[PDB]
Amino acid sequence: RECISIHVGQAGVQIGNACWELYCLEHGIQPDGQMPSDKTIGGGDDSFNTFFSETGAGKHVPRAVFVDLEPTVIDEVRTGTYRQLFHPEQLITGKEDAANNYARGHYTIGKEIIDLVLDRIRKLADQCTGLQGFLVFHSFGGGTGSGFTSLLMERLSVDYGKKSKLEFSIYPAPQVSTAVVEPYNSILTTHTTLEHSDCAFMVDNEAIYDICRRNLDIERPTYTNLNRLISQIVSSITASLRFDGALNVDLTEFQTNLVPYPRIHFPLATYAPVISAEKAYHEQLSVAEITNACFEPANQMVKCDPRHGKYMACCLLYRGDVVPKDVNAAIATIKTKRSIQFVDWCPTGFKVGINYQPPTVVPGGDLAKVQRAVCMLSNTTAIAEAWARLDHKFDLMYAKRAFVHWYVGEGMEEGEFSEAREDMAALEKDYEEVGVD
Amino acid sequence: MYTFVVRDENSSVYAEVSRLLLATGQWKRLRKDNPRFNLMLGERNRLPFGRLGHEPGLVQLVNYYRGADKLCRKASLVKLIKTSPELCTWFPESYREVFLAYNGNVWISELLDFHVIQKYLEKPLLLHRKFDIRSWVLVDHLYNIYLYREGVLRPYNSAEMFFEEFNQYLMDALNTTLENSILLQIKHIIRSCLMCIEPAISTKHLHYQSFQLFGFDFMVDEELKVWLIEVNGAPACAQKLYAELCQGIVDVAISSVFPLSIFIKLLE
Amino acid sequence: MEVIELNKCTSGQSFEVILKPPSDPSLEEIQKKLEAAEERRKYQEAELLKHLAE
Amino acid sequence: REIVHIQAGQCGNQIGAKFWEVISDEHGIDPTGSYHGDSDLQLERINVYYNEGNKYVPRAILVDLEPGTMDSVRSGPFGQIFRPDNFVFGQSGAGNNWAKGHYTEGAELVDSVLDVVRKESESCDCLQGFQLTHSLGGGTGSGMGTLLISKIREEYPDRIMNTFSVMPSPKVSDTVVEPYNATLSVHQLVENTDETYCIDNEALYDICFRTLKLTTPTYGDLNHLVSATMSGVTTCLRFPGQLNADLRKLAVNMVPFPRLHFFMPGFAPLTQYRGLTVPELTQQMFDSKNMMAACDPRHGRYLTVAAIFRGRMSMKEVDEQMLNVQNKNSSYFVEWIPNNVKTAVCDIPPRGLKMSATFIGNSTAIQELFKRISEQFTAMFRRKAFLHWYTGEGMDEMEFTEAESNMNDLVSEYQQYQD
Ligand SMILES: COc1cc([C@@H]2c3cc4c(cc3[C@@H](Nc3ccc5[nH]ncc5c3)[C@H]3COC(=O)[C@H]23)OCO4)cc(OC)c1OC
Ligand SMILES: Nc1nc2c(ncn2[C@@H]2O[C@H](COP(=O)(O)OP(=O)(O)OP(=O)(O)O)[C@@H](O)[C@H]2O)c(=O)[nH]1
Ligand SMILES: Nc1ncnc2c1ncn2[C@@H]1O[C@H](COP(=O)(O)OP(=O)(O)CP(=O)(O)O)[C@@H](O)[C@H]1O
Ligand SMILES: Nc1nc2c(ncn2[C@@H]2O[C@H](COP(=O)(O)OP(=O)(O)O)[C@@H](O)[C@H]2O)c(=O)[nH]1
Ligand SMILES: [Ca+2]
Ligand SMILES: [Mg+2]
Ligand SMILES: [Mg+2]
Ligand code: NA
């Protein structure tokens, strides 16, 4: 079983390069793709083979495709250290981008390049003996990220039907660079993929940015900082697929353990501990400490107050020196002094996975290596707050129909704005029903 | 310079506070929907918090504590006392079928035909004159409890008074000070409630900070024992006490966060 | 808190602690939508070119 | 994403020529087209405005109905760098009549020009669109310019169309009939340009006279502010960076409604060895006296705004300043467009400045400019003064009436949203 990851838009690609780098460091695979640890030269069914493939030369190639409507980003991958790691076909670039327009990437430019990307994915799928699913990483705001991604979602839902697909979308952050029309793009792509997505992990650049200023003491986090921190988080989630484990060992386990209702497939993520590598000595936080930090909004990837939302499921994923007893103790302590409430139709419990392997930090990164860490994936109604915001924005622009023309010009119709907006409005009511009493 | 947006026109207290902010020469009023507001006199109902604290390079503060309705609403207050382990002798019993378990037996059949069923205080301390003890307590972003010193006391048949005057009557008629007879139990009651709900409404680490003034109703019996009636999330103020309390609110809460005692430090 | 489903392997272990118990679209349809735009677009372009000719 | 630059008429050819000189310096290109810059940044996006004996040639087509203007450019410092075949002019001249340019004596040369354009557009790997420079109140660039835009739009209806249009002013006027030519040009642009940078020849003067203290500003003076402003707006396109702006994205983010594609440029330091502080640059950038359009932003409301800071400076301090401005001036920002202001920083500073700031704003105040032009037109048109010079070319009062009207509508639209 193998996971084909797909990276659409700048973000996706960017973050991707990062995730794959961290993956190559964790799995001790050299930049040439030659993994010394690997004894199954061009073979084996080890855990890491889910995200890599062993060539007859012994090099290992990620089972993913980097694609963007412009080339300059994917050209960097082609010219990067991991350039050898990735196969040229895996890298699909175009001549012009969507120029920040959902409609432009989805319809106008989507149709031109949709089939070529589906072919490449299909070549990967054929090499896979049993594809578990697809990991799509993208950004709501950009018009390739939203438009072209949602079109690829519908296509993958048709061509690969059964296979499961996990999202990794990047909620738009005004602090970070952002186009004015990005709320439109976000709603549109949400609405379109809402049924094509099995489980969607959102990462607000607003939250990641402040986390880098705060824990890493970075005044102006660059995308690089932000992507590194995100890669650590993705690695925590992807580690159940890339290593031997009983928790979330296949893509289905993520939906089964975290998504009670299909529409509520957006689980809040919280990670600990984020330590600055510049600091020479760092206090070693305990299993209880990291466990408690998970319940702090500052360490959430999407700002929101879980105290005012019910929980539908919660999973703690520890990496480092962590034992079951520590986890149980911390849970108990935190539960007594925390305002944790689960929906009645759900049991109050926490599935805990622990990987003895410690967190891995990229060399010279601003993240200091830690001896243990935890990343909590919890499905709270509080995530619906982030929907509201975006929604509000939309409205304010949509009342004047500002910037609509551009989209309309791409062949899209003004009705689709209302459709997507109603659907978000339903999804916001569902969250309030499940949690709000 | 500072910006604030008044979204609660009916708020008399905060109406005065916003006027003082204008007077400072360092606070200016914005459109009710204007996002770039340092402070917000949010509306008492459906105040939007999910959009607060997300404006880049803007500190945001609100005149209400999210989740504080539990202590305020009469129904939630009773539940809170009963569910909360920390939360209780000072609070009059209130009420399903347990109410019948009625088996002095006055409350405040026909009533059931006509809420919460709290045993009526048959024996009320009378100056025969019944009075209501109103205390105003403000909680800053640190959740430090502060109790406005001024208080207002708002014939009987079995079937506005200042603290100073009331204390004088207590000393002349009862040989006791308002502080030892009643005001000590008030403090304990206030701290008990607020600190019970403090974890649930704390904004210490939240992206937006909060503050809020409260009015607690106390009823003192013949034995000079205080009894909690209700907590007011948006309490008014005595006309004379309006200026002091509003000014205090501006200095303790608006000014601590946004720098440009008439209160008792129950918590700090 | 009751721990269950305790799995130990060389990579890690997992368990489940419970504090308390509980109380499509056809390719044609896709393509039809995409083509529709095309047309709508074309219409517009034509209109523009016709205004240009006038 | 090459950009086909096109300069028409005297004014258009003069300002365009400096623009090339300036950006050639910044990109380390000398008059011969050879490169000697010390940083690769310069060569990283040079293809946006140049085509490469390892020499970069500007992707510019010069257009005029009289040789004089184009001959001066050829004699200019960078006259060599401009491709000789791209020089395209006639001998009739346009006698300052839109007609003479948009109808009578331009219909000829227009075809010749479209051919060079076609040649440039073919070589371009990805044609971003076209850049045009002209004076809305003259004859070749006012009239013929708008004609080429229309022709261009028909051949390349998928490309962005941007114009640096020089709004005529009584302070710096050449003929009484300049309002007429402007009003006609305005309406052309309203329909066939995606982006138009309004550079009022009035303001420029003022700035020069007042601020820069120049009693008798010459056209060179004004042109100097113009070249600087030009380099500014075009920075993000020329130089690589975090925000690789492009014409299309630029239109997508600053244009809430099509007709409203007219922007007020602003620059600071208005020129010096004392580099301004990031607060100083930020207060001047939004300063009325630093905008090249003669409109008061306070009299209207900013639909959208985009800033760029060139030179080494504190990115954080930059962001802080911008935030302060927006927060202190919240009333001048449309609420219906969330986050309507954005900033960007380039490391390479303008030539001879340690750091600068360029401002691009779609303010409803821009209507002032069109109101001025409309009043003038109305004054003369009410008595049909000088109209025989256009009726002689075959035009009709009705056409003057229509253009007059449209410019009034556009004024109305800017106000509607303003309130
Ligand atoms: C001031 O700096 C500049 C900004 C722009 C516009 C622009 C104009 C705006 C705006 C945002 C943006 C911004 N839009 C954008 C695009 C892609 C994104 N990807 N991810 C985020 C994101 C954001 C620019 C990045 O590309 C552009 O052409 C855009 O807000 C209201 O007005 C063009 C420029 O050239 C002239 C320019 O130089 C002066
Ligand atoms: N965290 C992170 N966010 C990114 C990154 N790149 C872009 N963004 C975000 O991306 C959004 C814009 O989307 P892009 O990825 O740039 O757009 P796109 O997919 O390339 O599509 P186009 O509009 O045609 O370029 C902004 O909101 C940024 O916050 C990144 O590399 N890391
Ligand atoms: N159990 C009880 N015994 C005696 N008196 C009681 C009582 N419950 C309430 N009261 C009196 O009756 C009045 C009604 O109580 P309550 O405070 O709820 O009034 P209210 O509904 O107007 C809210 P508020 O007074 O804060 O505005 C109080 O002022 C109190 O003095
Ligand atoms: N800023 C600036 N304005 C100019 C310049 N030359 C002419 N103008 C303006 O252009 C208008 C006349 O147009 P002109 O250049 O003679 O156009 P033409 O018929 O095509 O040559 C007048 O308002 C002048 O104000 C110049 O070099 N710089
Ligand atoms: Ca292997
Ligand atoms: Mg992109
Ligand atoms: Mg002339
Ligand atoms: Na002739």
Which one of D1, D253, D305 would you mutate to disrupt binding with A, by most A Cβ within 10 Å of its Cβ?
A: D253
How many residues are present in chain D?
A: 419
* Lateral strand order in the sheet of A199-202: A91-93, A64-68, A2-8, A131-139, A164-170, A199-202
Told to judge if A253 belongs to the known catalytic residues of this protein, a careful annotator would answer yes
Whether residue B56 and residue D323 make contact (CB cut-off 8 A), yes or no, is: yes
Instruction: Using CA atoms of B79, B84, B86, B92 in order, give the dihedral in degrees to the nearest 10.
Output: 10
CA of A9 to the centre of ligand 2 (A): 7
Instruction: Kindly report the three-state secondary structure assignment for every residue of D258-294.
Output: CCCCEEEEEEECCCCCCCCCHHHHHHHHCCHHHECCC
What residues of A are in the C interface, CB distance below 8 Å? Answer: 47, 103, 107-108, 110-111, 151, 154-155, 157-158, 195, 243-247, 324, 327-328, 331-332, 335, 342-357, 409-413
Catalytic-labelled residue, pool A2, A167, A253, A416: A253
Chains that touch B (3 or more CB pairs under 8 A): A, D
Q: What sign does the CA torsion over D39, A221, A94, D238 have?
A: negative
DSSP assignments along A394-425, one per residue: HHHHHHHTTTHHHHHHTT--HHHHHHHHHHHH
Phi, psi torsion values for A172, nearest 5 degrees: -75, 140
Q: Look up tokens 């992707």; give the residue.
A: D59
Q: Which of residues 228-287 of D touch B (CB under 8 A)?
A: none
Q: How many CB atoms lie within 10 A of CB C14?
A: 25
Separation in Å, CA A117 to CA A9, A69, D199: 13, 11, 46
Equal fold, A1-267 vs A268-382: no
What residues of C are in the D interface, CB distance below 8 Å? Answer: 45, 48-49, 52
According to DSSP, the β-strands at D341-346 and D302-311 are parallel
How many residues are present in chain A?
A: 437
C-alpha span between D419 and D407 (Å, rounded): 19
Whether the CB of D10 sits within 6 Å of ligand 4: yes
Whether residue D253 and residue A180 make contact (CB cut-off 8 A), yes or no, is: yes
Ligand number nearest CA of A205 is 2
| Cβ atoms of residues D29 and D12 within 8 Å | no
Residues of D in contact with A402 (CB under 8 A): 256-257, 336-337
Which of the listed CATH numbers 1.10.287.600, 3.90.76.10, 3.20.20.70, 3.40.50.720 matches domain A383-436?
1.10.287.600
In D27-52, which positions are buried (b, 16+ CB within 10 angstroms) versus exposed (e)? bbbbeebebeeeeebbbebbbbbbbe
| Cβ atoms of residues D201 and D169 within 8 Å | yes
CA of A69 to the centre of ligand 6 (A): 7
Q: How many CB atoms lie within 10 A of CB D210?
A: 10
Q: Which residues contact C43 (CB under 8 A, 6 or more apart)?
A: none
**Minimal Cα distance from D188: which residue of C?**
C52
Chain B within 8 Å of A174 (Cβ-Cβ)? yes
C-alpha span between C15 and A324 (Å, rounded): 8
Instruction: Using CA atoms of B60, B64, B66, B68 in order, give the dihedral in degrees to the nearest 10.
Output: 160
> Which residue puts its alpha carbon closest to atom 21 of ligand 3?
B230
C-alpha span between B265 and D148 (Å, rounded): 77
What residues of A are in the D interface, CB distance below 8 Å? Answer: 72, 95-96, 99-101, 174, 177-181, 183, 219-220, 393, 396-397, 399-400, 402-403, 405-406
Whether residue A409 and residue C44 make contact (CB cut-off 8 A), yes or no, is: yes
Whether the CB of D17 sits within 6 Å of ligand 4: no
Q: Look up tokens 């909620």; give the residue.
A: A171
> Which residue puts its alpha carbon closest to atom 8 of ligand 2?
A11
Ligand number nearest CA of D243 is 1
Residue A200 sits at the vertex; the CA angle it makes with A199 and A203, to the nearest 5 degrees, is: 150
Q: How many CB atoms lie within 10 A of CB A126?
A: 9
- For C11, the closest of A103, A346, A356 (CB atoms) is A356
Residues with CB under 5 A from ligand 5 (ion): A 38, 40, 44, 54
Question: CATH homologous superfamily for A268-382?
Answer: Tubulin/FtsZ, C-terminal domain (3.30.1330.20)
Q: What sign does the CA torsion over A223, A229, A235, A236 have?
A: negative
Name which of C4, C26, C22, C27 is nearest C14 in CA terms.
C4
Separation in Å, CA A191 to CA A197, A263, A265, B186, D392: 11, 10, 13, 54, 60
Tell me whether residue A195 is annotated as binding.
no
According to DSSP, the β-strands at A348-355 and C2-8 are unpaired
Helix, strand and coil content of chain A, in percent to the nearest 5, comes to: 45, 20, 35
Residues of C in contact with D157 (CB under 8 A): 45, 48-49
Question: How many CB pairs below 8 Å do chains B and D form together?
Answer: 22
C-alpha span between A75 and A78 (Å, rounded): 5
Find the helix or strand (DSSP H, E) in which A246 lies: none
C-alpha span between D405 and B168 (Å, rounded): 82
**Minimal Cα distance from A206: which residue of B?**
B54
Domain positions in chain A are: 1-267, 268-382, 383-436
Angle between the N-to-C axes of helices A384-400 and A182-193, in degrees from 0 to 180, rounded to the nearest 10: 120
**The CATH fold of domain A1-267:** Rossmann fold (3.40.50)
Specify the experimental method. X-ray
CA of A71 to the centre of ligand 1 (A): 19
> Which residue puts its alpha carbon closest to atom 9 of ligand 3?
B229
C-alpha span between A303 and A202 (Å, rounded): 11
| Cβ atoms of residues D294 and D205 within 8 Å | no
Instruction: Kindly report the three-state secondary structure assignment for every residue of chain B.
Output: CEEEEECCCCCHHHHHHHHHHHHCCCEEECCCCCCCCCEEECCCCCCCCCCCCCCCCCCCEECCCCCCHHHHCHHHHHHHHHHCCCCCCCCCCCCCHHHCCCCCCCCCCHHHHCCCCCCCCCCECCCCCCCCEEEEEEECCCCCEEEECCCEECCCCCCCEEHHHHHHHHHHHHCCCHHHHHHHHHHHHHHHHHHHHHHHHCCCCCCCEECEEEEEEECCECCCCCCEEEEECCCCCCHHHHHHHHHHHHHHHHHHHCCCCCEEECCC
